[PDB]
Amino acid sequence: DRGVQMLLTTVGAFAAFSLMTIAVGTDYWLYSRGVCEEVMTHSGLWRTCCLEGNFKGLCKQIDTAEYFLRAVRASSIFPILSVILLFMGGLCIAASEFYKTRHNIILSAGIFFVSAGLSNIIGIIVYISANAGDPSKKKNSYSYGWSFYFGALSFIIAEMVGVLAVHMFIDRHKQL
Amino acid sequence: RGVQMLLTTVGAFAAFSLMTIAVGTDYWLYSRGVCEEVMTHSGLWRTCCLEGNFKGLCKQIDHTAEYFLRAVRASSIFPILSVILLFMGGLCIAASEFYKTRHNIILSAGIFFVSAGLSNIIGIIVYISANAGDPSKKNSYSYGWSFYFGALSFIIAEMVGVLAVHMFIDRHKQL
Amino acid sequence: RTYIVTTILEDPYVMLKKNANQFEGNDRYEGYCVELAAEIAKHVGYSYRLEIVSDGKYGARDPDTKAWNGMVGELVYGRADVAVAPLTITLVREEVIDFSKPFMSLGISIMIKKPQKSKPGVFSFLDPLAYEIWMCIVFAYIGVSVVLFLVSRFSEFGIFNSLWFSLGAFMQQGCDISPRSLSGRIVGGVWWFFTLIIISSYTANLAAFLTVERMVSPIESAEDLAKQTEIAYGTLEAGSTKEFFRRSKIAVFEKMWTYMKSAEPSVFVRTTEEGMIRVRKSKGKYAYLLESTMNEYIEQRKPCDTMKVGGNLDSKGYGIATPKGSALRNPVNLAVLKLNEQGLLDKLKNKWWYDKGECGSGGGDSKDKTSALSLSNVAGVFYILIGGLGLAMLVALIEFCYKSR
Amino acid sequence: VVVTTIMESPYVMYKKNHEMFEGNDKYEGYCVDLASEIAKHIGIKYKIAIVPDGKYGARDADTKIWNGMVGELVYGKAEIAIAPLTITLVREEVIDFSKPFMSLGISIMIKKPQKSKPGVFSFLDPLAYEIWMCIVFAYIGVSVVLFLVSREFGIFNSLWFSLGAFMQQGCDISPRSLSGRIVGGVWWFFTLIIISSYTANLAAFLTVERMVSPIESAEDLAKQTEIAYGTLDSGSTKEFFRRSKIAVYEKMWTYMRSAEPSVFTRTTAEGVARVRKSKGKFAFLLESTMNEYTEQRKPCDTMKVGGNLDSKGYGVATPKGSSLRIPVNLAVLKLSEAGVLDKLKNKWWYDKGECGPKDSGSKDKTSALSLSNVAGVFYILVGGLGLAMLVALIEFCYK
Amino acid sequence: VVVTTIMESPYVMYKKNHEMFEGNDKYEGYCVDLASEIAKHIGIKYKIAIVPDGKYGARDADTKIWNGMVGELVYGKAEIAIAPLTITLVREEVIDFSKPFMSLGISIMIKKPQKSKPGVFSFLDPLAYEIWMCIVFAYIGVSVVLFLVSRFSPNEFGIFNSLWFSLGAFMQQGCDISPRSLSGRIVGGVWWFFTLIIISSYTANLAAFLTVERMVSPIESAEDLAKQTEIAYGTLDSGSTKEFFRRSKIAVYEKMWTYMRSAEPSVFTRTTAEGVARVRKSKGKFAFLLESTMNEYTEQRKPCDTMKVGGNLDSKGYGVATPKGSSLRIPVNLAVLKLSEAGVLDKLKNKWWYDKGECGPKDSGSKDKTSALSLSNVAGVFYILVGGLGLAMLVALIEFCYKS
Amino acid sequence: RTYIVTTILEDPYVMLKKNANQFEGNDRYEGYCVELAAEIAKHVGYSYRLEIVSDGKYGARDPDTKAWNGMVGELVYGRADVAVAPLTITLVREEVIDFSKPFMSLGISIMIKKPQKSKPGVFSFLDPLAYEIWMCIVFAYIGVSVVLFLVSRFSEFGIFNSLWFSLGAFMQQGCDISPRSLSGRIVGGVWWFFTLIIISSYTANLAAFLTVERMVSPIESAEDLAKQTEIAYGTLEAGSTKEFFRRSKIAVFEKMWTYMKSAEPSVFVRTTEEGMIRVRKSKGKYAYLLESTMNEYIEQRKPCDTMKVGGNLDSKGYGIATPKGSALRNPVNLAVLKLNEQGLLDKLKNKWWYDKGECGSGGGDSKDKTSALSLSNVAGVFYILIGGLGLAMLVALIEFCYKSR
Ligand SMILES: O=c1[nH]c2cc(C(F)(F)F)c(N3CCOCC3)cc2n(CP(=O)(O)O)c1=O
Ligand SMILES: O=c1[nH]c2cc(C(F)(F)F)c(N3CCOCC3)cc2n(CP(=O)(O)O)c1=O
């Protein structure tokens, strides 16, 4: 009983890739009561825009132990690293499903899934420490949007594939 | 292993001497009570005053769970059971020193020491709850070396009991 | 000869009968002063025929063009001899007419919105430590579990074993499982430190939350009301309360008089009902500084949201009005004194102020004041716990399937 | 004008400088200041005098004379009585009374409420009884369900596992089932959260140490409370309690009649000395004026008013056929309306006090934890150890 | 009798918009009530005439004309002038000055802080500073000594095993193998006692720090303000404060003047309104320095975010003016002194200064805010967790590289 | 011609010559006042001859039965030129002479003893418990250890092993040894319940102590002193402070005057130094309101145990007395105003009041309140730690000595 397991890992990693695409391309992250004044905004990691207000239609981009993380929040650099090594993980599992002889390719694959999990957590915590880390922010707040839960879903399916693909390593290593 | 039996002998006699000096003589606590701020010598039957305008007279002192603890603190029934219980314990230590063959009396004596230590420490806490859990109104909790004799009646009784058990986990091997 | 009585109806004195106009008139009157009038007419002997008030107002001195109005105005200007309806005592009334005796001792009172609050269930469980931190610490726990499996089986220690060790490590219970590789020991130690600080932070926050929640005290008296600025208070412009506040010279009274003298919001209201419904709409910070009897009357009303606090700030009194030189001045004084000392006045007050009230029949409904964590705060845990047990039972049966199907 | 006054505590007093002046300027208090204020209001030359009889003023009802102030006013010895006099039915047909310048009534008075020093209740003062019987029921249920779901955990091994988890410890043997993992994790989490809740509650309670008013806080609670209640032998309180129509005061009368005969006390000094010796004993239902007097004297321990009962009136006496009756009536009414007698009452009853802690609350040092709050711990410790030794002895006898 | 004042000051105010209380008495405020009181004292007619110069007054030596009220007095259009007027030499030698009715000083001003939300320092906030490296020093010492105990006795504990056992003891969860040595009992129990007392102390200290807040101000004195050199300071472009700073003599003021000499972010503000708006916009720098009266006035203005730290840098005062000696001069001097010694003047001053401001009505602080711990008080712990986990994977990777 | 200047022998403002005899004449006095006199004499231009008033008192213009004295009396009697001296501006001395300019500001300010509490070492360790409590914990430990050994050997266990497990069970620390049999199981259960409840109680108590230590209100201004009602405050029988208290008009100032006039502890002061000694000997239970110049003088030249707090409660100025009809009136006013605006007067004040002061409050850095701990209450912790460490090492070596013997 392993073929259905490779199928599950493939569909989980493709789901993670699709979640990365819907997280980067679109801006359904949080349902913030911003100014467009408290009104719903679609503020992205790459693209912040509004839906109501007097200027709806035009929108632009976002931007000794605190400058580094502010630079991260401005540049979104750990989410970029996460999606980059997630694409690398997709490429290497495509190679593994094409080349079944090699063994360390899935070692690399496992380290990309776990580093994707860690980088996604680092990005979401710096995002929420720049989101809930401002004491000024505001009668209505919280109530995070659907792509915040999609990033949480990306983490939980990353944990699922980091269970099952690491189990591929375990049973292939005892096979080895 | 005669060192262990002589340790039991000296511990039992020292315990008897210290309990006699502790409960038989009013020497328990130092205080600034009224007989004014005067030191008092309170025991079980008779409390002595040492200064003040009442100098020279030593006065006989009287006295769901609150009634039980008040009766325990007044009548000192747990100290009374402790001293009677360890008197029986000392009797069977004398018997074991004489009769080196009976087994139940000396193991039972081990239970008598541990139960008497428990009874003495709970008598200490109940009398210090009659004094501190019933504060009336610094140096009030002063032990005039007879509460330290009760502390010895706990700790060196624990020592003699544990070395008796060390002799008893070896007496189980002996028999 | 016959005699007449004049009355004024606001609350709850000259209430009309529930049968409307099918009765004979003055006998259709249920209240305090009407029963008092009937009893005091039976005491000495005279007719208690009710007289309709001309304007419905109690009347004042009216310094413009002199004269008088109300019950006292009818009494001075003929065709009125007995006034049973209660009215306060002041200088201008004594300057013209005289009273017999006060039949209660009242004063100005302070009222506040009744504190109504309901403790939640599972929401009080996640109260002191937010909502997002729980979700992301569950995420951190499951991530540490899977990466602990990786580091333990990369250098026993299955995914179930790693989940068990991480579950026992997340909240300090201990286990017989222990890592061997130095990386496993390092990650276990980092996890232990993190969750130790998390539990300490939760305990500190919960202790602080109860301390600040029970530290606050209910408002009472006058000096605490004066020192309190976030609770607000005021009075009506057209009333004797404003005149009493302005004419007072005592330091505390002048202090809060200066306080609401500079009233920037719309503090002052027109009628008692308007201020009462404004209190109900606000329910967090407002006051009216209304009378004691009116406060006790509003306290016993069906919406059941007003209560009396503090005491009487002054010593005002009621009375019944009689003219000068009449033959019914001394006997009515003896009658009202006899009723005061007999206790029948207290019986009538208890009957028409406590017994017939549709609210607060059992006034002592909440007086235990149990300042301890009851089964209304953490019992939601007892839900999810047994719910987890229920889930355990569910997973039991399915793993029973795993050993039976 | 000459006025006679009884030697009573809150109205007149013999000054410490007795040789300073003999006559008018020899008394300081509520009564003389009120008399001076009304004399300045109307305009008269006023003096002060003491009653030669010493009685407060009442009718003996057999000699057809009154014993006191009203007796000497009717029989022609004084023309005004600024000393206070409660208004009753008998003193209206022979004397005249003005509007009440002060309101008084029968009010309760209890001893000082202090922090309790319980033995077993101190162990369980945080949380409640209900939550702890619920937790022991949950403990039994969890232990039996984790015993049955494993069928190495037998009927004592499962109990020991649950017991070790219940005070935040570990165990030697851990199960391998997923249901066992779920139940162990949820029980551990519940144990940790309830210990955190308990320690937060205990910390808040110990850092606030806030006192709560006793059960005797209302008339119905006084009737439902087993604490004793005493009052004077005879007087206004006894006359009011003799005849009632409320049917709760009848219950109080029956309680007094069926209780011990010690509830009757001769003097108020003896009564306060009696109630001072204990926190419970017999509490009083006495005059509000004397209650306000006693709450702001040198021993500031009993300072409780509680609820208010009854309604009376303090008035100024005036002989019949006197032209100054209307004058003194309008004077006292103008005083009580405009406000200087209320100011005088404040300055002499609340401002004039030996202790100021009653007006504004203060804090106290937490000090050491002592042993009153901890002796219950060692009591349950010795109870557990004694039960363990008893079951060990009976197990030795058993096998 | 003509008297003058300035509308550009917190001493007069227009009644309603227009045509309200027509006649002479139109404006209400501190100075006009002071004038009314002294007029009731001595007896004089009132006026509301205002000089259209706008500027309060200066010594224009080139033109030899004084501007505003001082020129309107010295060249002659009135006899009494009550207004905020500082007293210096050039205005004294032409017009005499009476005793000042209220003390004056120049003080610094900083914006109101809102909260402190650090990262690792938030975890580092409770329980001293030196304790952490004291703790790690104690940990290293106890670990090496207990390893010496286990190795010198002739056991199943290496340096890593001893380190992990000591940490598991420190973290209050347990371990795998007890040392089981009669020597090791004392050291194990003592280190257990240490870690339990330190976790209890940490929890209680965090509870005490969280249950209340006191919020110590960043600055408390002008000397410390000069010493810290982390918050930008700017007086004004020109005026009395700039003239005093340019010609001071006390030792720290020369260093302050050299500090304003190297002025990068244009600390010479053109107007006081622009300066207070800028310091209200940003609280990290650009702290202001102005007179005490305007500071206490801004303390009672609508934003409600401004305080003073105490301490007066200079000493001046406002006094009344009168052209030359006459019958009115000694009269107004004695009236001003009679009102100054009596308690009416400071009653009127503090009453009218403290009723018009709703900001200071809530004195001290408000305790009706419990909130909850957001991530900002916890993100240091989350960050050290994720850093430790990343470092654990880093050391696992380099261990894989070293061993295989 | 020559001019005479009169100077009052006042403690903060003038010194008697310590060298005295060998340098007499003009250089008999050193202080702020004589330095200001020399400076204004150099500015205006004249010669100064020092004089001392006969009565040694400031004096006043009270309408008594003649016998006028003081500095204003010396000026008005004609035997004076200019009175360069401290002089409070007031009405009684304004009607006969005029004062020049206020060069310093006076305000009555409260002083308070400096609160210095030394945090102990091992004494602060067991501070949030009782010595009783700790001795019962130790004895319960040893008794439960010995009875656990008894029940383990009664129902595989050594006394060392029983000590290990009893330490771990009391200590909330895990171990690999378990209490076999149900009697040992229930002993262990009672033991963990006991130690958990004691640790919870101790943590709660120390948290309560830290909370009540942090939640304290230091005295600031006059309102806090008015509403604290714990520290007694009083002033001299006569003087400017008493006159201000009698003529107080502010509501809070009238309140504190009434509180002082209650006179339960009375003024309890005769001279300034007597009150200073009393308030230093009162251990912070007394308070004194005095002129801020004396307060700054005591803050530095007196030993550093009394300190200033709060601002000036009133604004009163200084001046130098000048004759009403002399030619030395206007130039000296111009000179003193020029020195006030220049800052050299402030330079002289700072030089005489900050440099030659025997205290280190303003000449050195203070203590920064960073809250939290300060390695003081936890020093005994690591102390007993390293003591147990050394004891364990030495008992290991006596065990090895047993091995070698
Ligand atoms: O004799 C008088 N007795 C009064 C009795 C009452 C009431 F309490 F309702 F019984 C009131 N209410 C006060 C609250 O708002 C509704 C009217 C007014 C009275 N007034 C007129 P005031 O001048 O407004 O006090 C009198 O003159
Ligand atoms: O009308 C009456 N009013 C009374 C009012 C008071 C007081 F409380 F002082 F106001 C008192 N005090 C009771 C306590 O001892 C001192 C006198 C007695 C009164 N009595 C006498 P009784 O007949 O014993 O009640 C009356 O008759």
Ligand SMILES: O=c1[nH]c2cc(C(F)(F)F)c(N3CCOCC3)cc2n(CP(=O)(O)O)c1=O
């Ligand atoms: O006599 C004088 N009295 C002054 C009084 C005030 C103040 F009281 F604060 F209103 C001010 N403010 C300075 C800050 O902006 C608002 C006006 C300026 C004054 N100036 C001009 P400077 O020379 O620029 O001080 C004088 O000359």
